[PDB]
Ligand binder design. Structure first.
Ligand SMILES: Nc1ncnc2c1ncn2[C@@H]1O[C@H](COP(=O)(O)OP(=O)(O)NP(=O)(O)O)[C@@H](O)[C@H]1O
Lengths: 254, 56, 253, 254, 53
């Protein structure tokens, strides 16, 4: 009856312990430099194949911020405020979260599904007998592609969001280019409004990809488990991004 | 299953054309509308310091 | 009743799976279909008068064309069929009791008392009395097939189709399924269709066998007759010999 | 070479036409033929099971908005704005978007997998062979349970978000409470802004669930198809929500 | 289990009301009744508004 929940919680938490151990091995020892020349290939499916989604969302978010900012800011200071609010919002809160979640979706479920199949088909297992450690051959380049790709995407998301904001806020709705640009320069500091967006992005890139690899590399070889793993990678990295985003922003701007 | 194929494209084209229209039309509520009968007038001035296009 | 399929032609995925298939399913007899895998075996059964639409040809039940003729008859006519599709389907959200009971509700309006008794009788006919409240997902593989079969014979249908029941299994199970077919064909006056890759079992069960490959019938007969007409295709197929009209890819240089 | 793309575009658009046709066939209110106990049950999986995720997300978003609003407002010297901005941000832009994306999102993915599994397993084929039209048993209660559930979850998300906002903005950071509640009333209203938040969620609920059903159901039985469909639902659900969010907000508040 | 689904979903409804009533309070507007219209003439209403008090 009740003990059921008890057992569920106990096992899920044991699994986090396992994930921590896996992460340690993959990051801790990677001497096979000759085979890491392929991670550039792996990046194709994490980074290159995801620009379309990040770019389109960045444009819609920029345009939305432009319109909502404007309808509020006409009562307070659009001439000075569209610039400052569009750029701070995108650099501090949205590029690191919206790109992080779209990424967790598009790259995250695809990646976990792929590791999942590698395990389910027994293909991965056959490598143990050939002496090729699957963590160094299969997992390593996938985790690294995730680390590099999300941060570069995060920057693009914001770059597009700025275009979106200006396109409506300045060009269709009647605001000065001068004060838009100077306002942004007056209030946006590289140190640390641009820099903190990047730091949060690295944290999310590691946490989110780490989960996707871990769940794909599941214990139970049952077909039902692939769909379960895919749903869970989206849910867990999604909450983790929001949880960590809160703490990091609390420090960075508090 | 060859026969079903055609109908499917025709449905796409219509639903899609409608969606494109919806966007182009609906955004006119805020941008691209004069909201007037359109008469114009001119006037000249000695000093227009601080006017904007779109002032009332 | 007798089922006839004539001049069947069907194109899926721009490829022809079937080309002028002509079958006579003999009443009260076991009809079987054999052939290479991946050549339409499930498809051909579906085209018997299920949910697939042929491009050419006719499907006749009792000699009547089922296409167009009429909605109400066809709805009722459907109550005369039961099937095991591939691995066999059970609904995961329903108990065994409900999986067997389910098709009853498609054509009848019965009291809870009678629907319950029919389920009990049908489960005993396949050796499953007393497993009614377990969820099907907790059954061993041998039982999953038997539950699905109980559903198939739930309405006292005339035609039972077993889609590849012998394909891959445990020798104990093969013994059991063979016996259930022998028991039921007699107990319920059934016409059955067995479609299967495992030639050695089919050959001792069916009264009449068709060998189908590459969209055409390539020989027909009782198992005794098929052995008498050694078209290279049929002969290799029914013997397992690696020699015959099959290919390997090589040329030395 | 080039024609490859052309074939891809043509097939995806054809598929849309099919999806539109399916929606028309399912939407007629025909399900009344059977009981609706099935609906109540189905709601368990699409709605009730997701309350934990949406609640935790709402709390973190509320607290983040509180801290970011505050660190900007202290440079205006006008703290009454926490009430006005926490409320407008959540009611107009975030509850309708964050909830929609976490929803489908999780429910979106799980639903796609479940229907698709029933296709792959031959369960659906059997039902037609028996004579029970699967759209009235398998699809109907799933599409409607999704419609009711997301809008209801949107409200809870905002409600948690506002409370989280106050919890830091007023109670830890020293803002006089009276200005918070007054700021909310001045000038965002129950009869206008709350209403527009709900309307957007009805639209999103239909886009998300409609896509999830289609992706699961309408596909020839390719074994790799389930994992691909799950990823695809997340991507299309997400872009459709953002594209529509822009056009609707542009009217509601334009 | 169907009994649990039935005995549990009521919670989403109990929660829905709790928070909806909160929403009404947080953004409660003005409930007008027995209203009349009146008209008056003016020479200048510069910057007067459609929803002015
Ligand atoms: N609905 C569909 N639409 C398009 N292609 C399909 C569909 N279903 C399956 N496929 C293909 O169409 C055929 C399905 O039926 P079929 O050939 O009868 O399977 P089968 O012979 O029973 N398979 P197997 O049990 O492995 O031998 C195969 O050639 C599949 O590649």
């Amino acid at each position: 009856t009740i003990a059921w929940l008890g057992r569920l919680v106990i096992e899920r938490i044991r699994g986090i312990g396992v994930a921590a151990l896996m992460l340690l091995q993959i990051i801790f020892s990677l001497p096979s430099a000759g085979g890491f020349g392929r991670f550039v290939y792996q990046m194709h499916r994490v980074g290159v194949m995801s620009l379309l989604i990040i770019t389109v969302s960045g444009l819609f978010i920029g345009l939305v911020l432009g319109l909502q900012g404007y309808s509020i800011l006409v009562n307070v200071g659009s001439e000075s405020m569209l610039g400052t609010m569009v750029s701070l919002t995108l650099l501090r809160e949205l590029a690191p979260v919206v790109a992080a979640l779209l990424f967790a979706g598009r790259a995250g479920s695809a990646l976990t599904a792929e590791i999942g199949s590698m395990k389910q088909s027994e293909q991965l297992a056959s490598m143990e007998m050939i002496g090729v450690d699957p963590l160094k051959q299969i997992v390593s380049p996938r985790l690294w592609a995730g680390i590099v790709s999300l941060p570069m995407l995060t920057v693009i998301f914001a770059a597009i969001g700025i275009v979106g904001g200006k396109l409506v806020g300045v060009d269709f709705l009647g605001v000065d280019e001068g004060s838009f640009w100077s306002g942004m320069q007056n209030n946006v500091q590289f140190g640390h409004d641009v820099v903190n967006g990047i730091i949060k992005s690295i944290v999310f890139a590691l946490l989110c990809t780490w989960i996707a690899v871990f769940q794909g590399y599941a214990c139970d070889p049952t077909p039902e488990g692939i769909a379960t793993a895919m749903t869970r990678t989206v849910v867990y990295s999604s909450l983790c991004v929001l949880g960590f985003d809160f703490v990091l922003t609390a420090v960075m701007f508090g | 299953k060859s026969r079903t194929s055609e109908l499917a494209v025709g449905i796409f084209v219509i639903i899609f054309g409608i969606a494109l229209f919806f966007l182009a039309m609906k955004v006119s509520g805020l941008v691209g509308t004069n909201l007037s009968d359109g008469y114009t007038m001119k006037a000249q001035f000695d000093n227009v310091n601080g006017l904007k296009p779109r002032a009332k | 009743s007798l089922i006839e399929v004539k001049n069947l032609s069907f194109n899926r995925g721009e490829r022809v799976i079937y080309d002028n298939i002509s079958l006579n399913i003999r009443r009260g007899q076991i009809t079987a279909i054999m052939g290479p895998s991946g050549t339409g075996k499930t498809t051909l059964l579906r085209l018997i008068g299920g949910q697939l639409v042929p491009d050419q040809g006719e499907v006749l039940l009792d000699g009547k064309d089922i296409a167009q003729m009429s909605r109400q008859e066809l709805f009722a006519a459907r109550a005369r069929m039961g099937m095991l599709f591939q691995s066999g389907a059970l609904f995961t959200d329903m108990s065994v009791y409900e999986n067997v009971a389910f098709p009853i509700r498609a054509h009848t309006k019965l009291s809870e008392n009678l629907i319950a008794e029919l389920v009990a009788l049908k489960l005993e006919s396949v050796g499953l009395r007393g497993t009614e409240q377990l969820m099907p997902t907790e059954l061993s593989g041998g039982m999953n097939r038997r539950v699905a079969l109980a559903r198939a014979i739930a309405l006292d249908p005339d035609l039972i189709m077993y889609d590849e029941p012998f394909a891959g299994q445990d020798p104990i199970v093969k013994g059991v399924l063979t016996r259930l077919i022998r028991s039921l064909r007699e107990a319920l006056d059934l016409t059955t269709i067995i479609v299967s890759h495992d030639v050695p079992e089919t050959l001792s069960i069916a009264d009449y066998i068709y060998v189908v490959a590459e969209g055409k019938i390539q020989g027909e007969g009782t198992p005794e007759e098929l052995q008498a007409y050694a078209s290279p295709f049929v002969k290799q197929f029914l013997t397992g010999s690696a020699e015959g009209p099959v290919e390997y890819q090589f040329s030395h240089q």
